[PDB]
Amino acid sequence: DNILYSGETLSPGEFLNNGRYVFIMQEDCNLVLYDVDKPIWATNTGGLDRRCHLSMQSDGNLVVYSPRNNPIWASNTGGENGNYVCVLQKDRNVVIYGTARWATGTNIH
Amino acid sequence: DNILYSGETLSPGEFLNNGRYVFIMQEDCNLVLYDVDKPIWATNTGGLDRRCHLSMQSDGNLVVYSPRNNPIWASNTGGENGNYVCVLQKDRNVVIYGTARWATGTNIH
Amino acid sequence: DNILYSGETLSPGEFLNNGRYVFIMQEDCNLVLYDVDKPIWATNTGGLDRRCHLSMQSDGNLVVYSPRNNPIWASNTGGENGNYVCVLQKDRNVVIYGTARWATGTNIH
Amino acid sequence: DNILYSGETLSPGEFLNNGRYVFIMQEDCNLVLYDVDKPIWATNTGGLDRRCHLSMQSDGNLVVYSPRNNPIWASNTGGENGNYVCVLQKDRNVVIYGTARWATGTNIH
């Protein structure tokens, strides 16, 4: 669903979705935003390797990694340690937000 | 749905939802998080007035306002001008994040 | 999410949701539709037993069963064998539909 | 969202969605199911006309109509008058179900 939280990854073929928009870590290692069947943005790393994963890290940087765990693309927003979210929004932008400023503190474990 | 963006409000009776969790600006001016029919957190401003609205502001502060536009509760996170989101998360926390650090820039208007 | 398919069950504490509406198989064996924290319909079998499950069956009947697998409530719509769905709808009704009349035939396994 | 109810239509460019699946009434009058950017089924009426609509009717038939209101494709499931749903399911099938067999009767107006 529409959010990737810091600490989580998208494995090969996993995605975020919002309405007709899909943001997917393809198995060809390209990361693409589709509007239905039209690609509207990508990391342009298709063919660079196979079975990459996407990580939303707690330093705030969003990074595509190869199966050997070498970076192949990153947003370059690596900064203070904290909690972040990457959001596929209702207006079609994909946006990284953080750190957390306030919380009810009602989470469960 | 699970996000209130900076610049938007919840009017009386409007809500965020995620699974069995509901975060609603009640018409008695109380703002409450329910887990099904159990209230798990609230602003405890019920009865203070009627037909309040909730605003997620671009200074980053989340504020309950009376029909005359006087604040009656706030998160006290008012700070730099920017884009924020308030999120009802899958783990039951409600969290404010911002400002925006990175975007694909694919939004529409 | 808002549909229970024939062949599936809700275990104790599992639910359907649509916006502020929740339809849950409670662990007290009562099956209840909530509008936020207000109960608007129930099977009224609370206390009859503990850790019941809900089954949407392929004969079309929706049935609450006790841990020993004895029926304690049913919709009485048991009829022809086929595919059905129970839907929590956007207008707040909960409705059983079937059998299947037409399909693209694009399902995966 | 994933259901078209009897009595409703999809106008040009409107769609159903479920995860990475999208079922859209295109403005070229073709009705297509996409798995991300791959078309997996269609009515193959692209180019036949422009700005068609999709109707889920109360006789149970799902019909593509031209701007002049002449049928150009139909599921051929027109039958008894009642309530139906067309569902884009989690397993990638698109399925018509009806009529309604049972309801809580809690809808609002």
Ligand SMILES: OC[C@H]1O[C@H](O[C@@H]2[C@H](O)[C@@H](O)O[C@H](CO)[C@H]2O)[C@@H](O)[C@@H](O)[C@@H]1O
């Ligand atoms: O092919 C060029 C391509 O550049 C753009 O997107 C950028 C690339 O995907 C990659 O370099 O990562 C960038 C990081 O933040 C990303 O924006 C777009 O400007 C696109 O319009 C253009 O086609």
Ligand SMILES: OC[C@H]1O[C@H](O[C@@H]2[C@H](O)[C@@H](O)O[C@H](CO)[C@H]2O)[C@@H](O)[C@@H](O)[C@@H]1O
């Ligand atoms: O097999 C090629 C590939 O096509 C589509 O992915 C595309 C490629 O990653 C590359 O061409 O970049 C395109 C965006 O700029 C992207 O659409 C998908 O159909 C993919 O699944 C397939 O592997």
Ligand SMILES: OC[C@H]1O[C@H](O[C@@H]2[C@H](O)[C@@H](O)O[C@H](CO)[C@H]2O)[C@@H](O)[C@@H](O)[C@@H]1O
């Ligand atoms: O904080 C260091 C960080 O290192 C790895 O991450 C890197 C940083 O995010 C930044 O330097 O950009 C690199 C890619 O361009 C990226 O790999 C991991 O070791 C991470 O877990 C660690 O926190």
Ligand SMILES: OC[C@H]1O[C@H](O[C@@H]2[C@H](O)[C@@H](O)O[C@H](CO)[C@H]2O)[C@@H](O)[C@@H](O)[C@@H]1O
């Ligand atoms: O406060 C925001 C934050 O709360 C929850 O995360 C917690 C914090 O990272 C810190 O308290 O450490 C906790 C673990 O021991 C962790 O729960 C989450 O809901 C997170 O998503 C949120 O941003």
Ligand SMILES: OC[C@H]1O[C@H](O[C@@H]2[C@H](O)[C@@H](O)O[C@H](CO)[C@H]2O)[C@@H](O)[C@@H](O)[C@@H]1O
């Ligand atoms: O009734 C006391 C109540 O306090 C708490 O929540 C706080 C209040 O809702 C209000 O003061 O706003 C606070 C702001 O950030 C909010 O947390 C909780 O601690 C609750 O456990 C307690 O019942």
Ligand SMILES: OC[C@H]1O[C@H](O[C@@H]2[C@H](O)[C@@H](O)O[C@H](CO)[C@H]2O)[C@@H](O)[C@@H](O)[C@@H]1O
């Ligand atoms: O009519 C009272 C009120 O009850 C419920 O709201 C409650 C009140 O706002 C106050 O008691 O605080 C409770 C949480 O601490 C909250 O549940 C709702 O049923 C509401 O709709 C109703 O108006």
Ligand SMILES: OC[C@H]1O[C@H](O[C@@H]2[C@H](O)[C@@H](O)O[C@H](CO)[C@H]2O)[C@@H](O)[C@@H](O)[C@@H]1O
């Ligand atoms: O930036 C000033 C701000 O004022 C109003 O907002 C206030 C601030 O967020 C902060 O002071 O907290 C007040 C409540 O406790 C809150 O009203 C509005 O005028 C707003 O639009 C403006 O940006």
Ligand SMILES: OC[C@H]1O[C@H](O[C@@H]2[C@H](O)[C@@H](O)O[C@H](CO)[C@H]2O)[C@@H](O)[C@@H](O)[C@@H]1O
């Ligand atoms: O960059 C993040 C931001 O992008 C989009 O908002 C834009 C900015 O606020 C700035 O560019 O001004 C624009 C308007 O003239 C506005 O679109 C949104 O998608 C926003 O949600 C996002 O945080």
Ligand SMILES: OC[C@H]1O[C@H](O[C@@H]2[C@H](O)[C@@H](O)O[C@H](CO)[C@H]2O)[C@@H](O)[C@@H](O)[C@@H]1O
């Ligand atoms: O308490 C009486 C209750 O009856 C009603 O709902 C019915 C019961 O939940 C149970 O008998 O199962 C019925 C099956 O199809 C169900 O409707 C409602 O009429 C309710 O209004 C009334 O309170």
Ligand SMILES: OC[C@H]1O[C@H](O[C@@H]2[C@H](O)[C@@H](O)O[C@H](CO)[C@H]2O)[C@@H](O)[C@@H](O)[C@@H]1O
């Ligand atoms: O502990 C009692 C019970 O209260 C609520 O469930 C209620 C009961 O099942 C019975 O009273 O019927 C009510 C509807 O007619 C129903 O709300 C829940 O809070 C439940 O979790 C709790 O176990």
Ligand SMILES: OC[C@H]1O[C@H](O[C@@H]2[C@H](O)[C@@H](O)O[C@H](CO)[C@H]2O)[C@@H](O)[C@@H](O)[C@@H]1O
């Ligand atoms: O078709 C028989 C059916 O039997 C059980 O189900 C029952 C029927 O749905 C109907 O008789 O109502 C009963 C409750 O009031 C219900 O148990 C199971 O054996 C089922 O799997 C089987 O198909």
Ligand SMILES: OC[C@H]1O[C@H](O[C@@H]2[C@H](O)[C@@H](O)O[C@H](CO)[C@H]2O)[C@@H](O)[C@@H](O)[C@@H]1O
């Ligand atoms: O045709 C509607 C039906 O299709 C899919 O179910 C299939 C049928 O029950 C029949 O073909 O047997 C198949 C298994 O061997 C089964 O897949 C599902 O998508 C179902 O939900 C749907 O109603």
Ligand SMILES: OC[C@H]1O[C@H](O[C@@H]2[C@H](O)[C@@H](O)O[C@H](CO)[C@H]2O)[C@@H](O)[C@@H](O)[C@@H]1O
């Ligand atoms: O191009 C032939 C095409 O036929 C199929 O789907 C059918 C057509 O879209 C149209 O005739 O409407 C049919 C109605 O119920 C629909 O299935 C598929 O069999 C497809 O595999 C094939 O490519």
Ligand SMILES: OC[C@H]1O[C@H](O[C@@H]2[C@H](O)[C@@H](O)O[C@H](CO)[C@H]2O)[C@@H](O)[C@@H](O)[C@@H]1O
């Ligand atoms: O402009 C052509 C058209 O391409 C895509 O729609 C396709 C056509 O309707 C026709 O070729 O059938 C295809 C499926 O069999 C279908 O994908 C879309 O990109 C559409 O928006 C565009 O108008």
Ligand SMILES: OC[C@H]1O[C@H](O[C@@H]2[C@H](O)[C@@H](O)O[C@H](CO)[C@H]2O)[C@@H](O)[C@@H](O)[C@@H]1O
């Ligand atoms: O019940 C008649 C019906 O007529 C129109 O619908 C038609 C039927 O569903 C069936 O004959 O198939 C036709 C297309 O192949 C379809 O148009 C409308 O007049 C409808 O509203 C009416 O109920």
Ligand SMILES: OC[C@H]1O[C@H](O[C@@H]2[C@H](O)[C@@H](O)O[C@H](CO)[C@H]2O)[C@@H](O)[C@@H](O)[C@@H]1O
């Ligand atoms: O019973 C299932 C049905 O209930 C609701 O629809 C109603 C019926 O069509 C009949 O009662 O006429 C009513 C209008 O005067 C109408 O509400 C809906 O929730 C429908 O979706 C559902 O299938």
